[PDB]
Amino acid sequence: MRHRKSGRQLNRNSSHRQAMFRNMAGSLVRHEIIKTTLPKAKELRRVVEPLITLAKTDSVANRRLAFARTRDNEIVAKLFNELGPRFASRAGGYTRILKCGFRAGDNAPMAYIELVDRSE
Amino acid sequence: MIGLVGKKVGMTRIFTEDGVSIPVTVIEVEANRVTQVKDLANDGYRAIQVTTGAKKANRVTKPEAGHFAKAGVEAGRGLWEFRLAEGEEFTVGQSISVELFADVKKVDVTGTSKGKGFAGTVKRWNFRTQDATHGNSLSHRVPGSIGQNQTPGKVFKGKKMAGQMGNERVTVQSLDVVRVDAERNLLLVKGAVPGATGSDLIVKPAVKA
Amino acid sequence: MIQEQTMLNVADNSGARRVMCIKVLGGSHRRYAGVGDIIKITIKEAIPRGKVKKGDVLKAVVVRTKKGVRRPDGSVIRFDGNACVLLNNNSEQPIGTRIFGPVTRELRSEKFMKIISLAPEV
Amino acid sequence: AVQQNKPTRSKRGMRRSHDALTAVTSLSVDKTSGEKHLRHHITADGYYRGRKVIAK
Amino acid sequence: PRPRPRPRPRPRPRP
Amino acid sequence: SNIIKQLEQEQMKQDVPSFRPGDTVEVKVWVVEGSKKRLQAFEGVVIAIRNRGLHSAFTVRKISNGEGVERVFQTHSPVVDSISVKRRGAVRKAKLYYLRERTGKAARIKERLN
RNA sequence: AGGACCGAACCGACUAAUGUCGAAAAAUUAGCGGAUGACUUGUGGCUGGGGGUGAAAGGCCAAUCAAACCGGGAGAUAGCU
RNA sequence: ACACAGGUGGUCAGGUAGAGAAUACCAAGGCGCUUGAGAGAACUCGGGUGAAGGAACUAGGCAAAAUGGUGCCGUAACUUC
RNA sequence: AAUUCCUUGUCGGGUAAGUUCCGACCUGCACGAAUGGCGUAAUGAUGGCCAGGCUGUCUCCACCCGAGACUCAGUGAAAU
RNA sequence: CGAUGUCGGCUCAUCACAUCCUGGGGCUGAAGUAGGUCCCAAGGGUAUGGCUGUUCGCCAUUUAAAGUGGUACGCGAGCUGGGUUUAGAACGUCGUGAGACAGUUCGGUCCCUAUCUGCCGUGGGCGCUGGAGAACUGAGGGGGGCUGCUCCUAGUACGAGAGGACCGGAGUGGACGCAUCACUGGUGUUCGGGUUGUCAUGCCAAUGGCACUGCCCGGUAGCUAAAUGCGGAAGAGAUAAGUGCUGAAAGCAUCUAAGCACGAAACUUGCCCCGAGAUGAGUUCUCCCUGACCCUUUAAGGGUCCUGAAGGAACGUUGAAGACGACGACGUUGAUAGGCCGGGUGUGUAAGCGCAGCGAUGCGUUGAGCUAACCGGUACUAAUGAACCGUGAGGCUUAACCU
């Protein structure tokens, strides 16, 4: 009856749910900002932020640990090189949620999820 | 005999010297301070209104803040009233602590049980589940019949079917208190009490002595 | 935890080896039996030279359960097989003279003194 | 499953008494740009709490 | 505009 | 919470030997017979360990005279006296529940001696 | 060799569930029987209404069969509603 | 009758595992099936797991569960051999 | 007995308990020899019974994963 | 007869007492135990299986008992289609035959998205009249009320003996109901590991995707019982059957006519829950508002300006709260959620490197690595300043106290 539980089902099964958070985190890391629904942006905080925390310490096994997630050499190369030292001082809270209204298609609640960055 | 207001801190067990394990419930009982003493001249009956815990002084309303102003006590979370059984008499501002239960052996704990939400007839009323096989169609956990034929022509009041389960005031009587630790403001009672961890608990001595 | 139609092993040299529990005695609508309860059983298998034969209806007491019995300290003693000792129908005294396998301390209830004295362990 | 008599305009109207929409009535003016937007939502231009958060 | 499959008939008895 | 912790840490026995699943331990438990405060022994192979503070428990499987006997023990309960370990098994599984179906030569395990 | 065996295509529909204003005017799902023969299938023909055809159920004869459909006797008749 | 989970004859059919056109993943090639987003109540459908009992359920082992391949050993009553 | 009303005919087996089943007893309402009678290896998505394994069938359900049910946005029936 | 679904079974039950048990008594050919019969009493309970489609019935084993009836022989817009009662076929019989036989046997489509009444829950509006925040009283209503076994009394009373109590007290059980994961487990497709086939990361290695979570092994938190705690009461008032005291009518007698005392799981309370829409709308505490102008059919009137306080609502973070509503916590004067640190827990010795071995593989690093929902901390991120609703002292009459 959902007492003390956590984790949004999103009307989908586990295999698909893990698949997009593998894909959506790669889009968030690559473009430094994406546009998705508010519940999806909330559940994305529990995926990208552990990856950024893993990127804070560069080693050999950590790259393979960060390669089993998001399954692409480009994102793990984008990590551990610039995103690592850029979040070396902050302890958590690497992302930020900004509501931006609703979808024109089916009135789905949008929000802007981005890193605490982009002052270049 | 009056009671005090506590809080469920979850449960544990106490290992006695002879080896038997007593399942206990840790209930922290803070300093319950009397806010108002109801008298027969104004209210028609004798009772005391107390409070426990504390609240931040930004989320307390002016009607509640002014009520605690003349009481001489700090603003606690909520208010509770205990009926005086003609023997005891208290003053406004008198703090009652956990050592009042140091002489009683059985108490009753009252709290709001865990809400099961909208539960089915099987869960709520222990209804016997029908056949899951042998041709049964779409009637595995349904309540089945709910009345007779034309002659009553209606469903009687009080009929056991699906609805809200839990989140209800439940009183468990005659719970054996194991330890009354004054310095930690705790109260260990044998068995389980209604409510989740952190919920408010009303504990009073057992009327079924 | 023994109910109707449950197969039980025989923990004494009464002749039977493999029985069927047919009734849990000691109360109306009683579902299960403990490690100290009397149950009416029937015999489904027996040795050629036994004191009893196949199909006899007689009482028995469960001495071992796969579910196990819980001690007051919170521990449990779970066995790998449901065993029992055959009893006479009229008197609760056991039929066999030797007992195979250990029993529990909950069996000490002033009527099974002949059982725990012949028990080789516990 | 089916009705015995048709509902009236009263029964239809009294059923639709709770179907009325709700206004928002809580438009917040922006801190710097001074444009209307919803609470805890960015503006159409891309401002939130005075900062040009979207830069787009 | 089509009709309907008609209600399924029950097994008819006799004397 | 911390309120649970202080109540539990004053009841946990400090002198608990460190044992792993597969270790053949010899547990002595206090058994009472009315007026006889006896101390009987229970030696077997540990197949399951859960350590939840005061609620720590470990399961010991012993092959008695016939069938096997499983018995869990509350680690911090006063009923137990000694949890002294005889052998140190070499397994790579936290729960050895597969030992129930193996008997004889198939149920024995390798010594660790690391 | 086999109206042989297991078992795909193919043919068929034994059980259960769903579906019963259905995705479908008998289907889907999970299992099923035959699967070298009395097998299956494409194409083109022949046999027709008191007739054809029927390893025979009074089954099929264009989603309709103890006498198909269309038109005509015919606004048959109805002591019934 | 539908932009319909149905039916529609013939040809090619590759890599790995596999006896196999089964099956599992893929190449070539084509698609994500023309309403989506939230919540994770009762209840309905397809499933997964389970203490102890093991058909005591039920008209009925219905449904589920269970067996399942290759090589070798060995295989009863009866029989038209 | 696919046949027998009396009938759950009587005996035995199976089961703790068996109007079912199996082998007999003939007292065959109302079997019977090509509208065939009695058996019969093999065969059967055939009928009835029993035994082992197996299990949520059940004791007694409990949890979890999905598709609806629920909410929001768009389109939008029906029996009566 | 322009349709009232028929038996049996499952689930769900309701009511009556002509009461099966528990409870209270009278008579007994009631020594005790155990009974026979009758009266009061419906509060609670009132079997599991083999056979049969069967209700019923036979048998086995229990139980305090396994009550009788009504409710469309209760209940198919709650489930089944086994029987009965379609269309096929077969056996015995009847008839020349088509066919038929409360004679038998095999097999054989059980539709409906709830409009209203009803019931279970949960909301919105308004009212209670100055508004608001809390705590309550309590009308009334609902829930529950079952009992076995053992011991002491006492092997006493009784009884030739065998046997064997009433009363009272204590312990321990079955079923039911309530609550909760402290213990034991189950689940735990969001955690870890093993492993088969294939594909991919340019290749080894290491991984990831798919094949029911591919198949498994365990398992965090929650939920859950098989697990663990509690309950049925004691007592009081009024009584039923029944037992009585005194006592006339009727000089006696008499439980009754006057009066007075007992007397049941039945009634009202006592135990638990809801509950002031109880429109009879209740009680107590606390907080806020004490500004001017016109029109006037000068009335508890309407309109203008200035202020709209307490509080609520909205929004966001959210919850062991929840279908949606609703309830609860927080919103920087912060621990509400997410992230982070430490820990705990679970799985099991990660990757890389070095050594040994022809190799698979083994050892050290390493009880390492990874950890979900857990615990304790930490503003690193999101909970924005504000706007919205809600007003400006609260009607008439009478009585009592001060002017």
From Swiss-Prot, chain B:
The modification N6-succinyllysine is found at K38. The keyword Chloroplast does not apply. Methylated by PrmB. Pfam families: Ribosomal_L3 (PF00297). Keywords: Methylation, Ribonucleoprotein, Ribosomal protein, RNA-binding, rRNA-binding. The modification N5-methylglutamine is found at Q150. One of its GO terms (biological process) is cytoplasmic translation. GO terms for cellular component: cytoplasm; cytosol; cytosolic large ribosomal subunit. InterPro entries: Ribosomal_uL3, Ribosomal_uL3_bac/org-type, Ribosomal_uL3_CS, Transl_B-barrel_sf. The keyword Transmembrane does not apply. Signal peptide: none annotated. It comes from the Bacteria. GO terms for molecular function: rRNA binding; structural constituent of ribosome. Belongs to the universal ribosomal protein uL3 family. NCBIfam families: L3_bact (TIGR03625). Part of the 50S ribosomal subunit. Forms a cluster with proteins L14 and L19. In pull-down experiments interacts with CedA. One of two assembly initiator proteins, it binds directly near the 3'-end of the 23S rRNA, where it nucleates assembly of the 50S subunit. This is Large ribosomal subunit protein uL3.
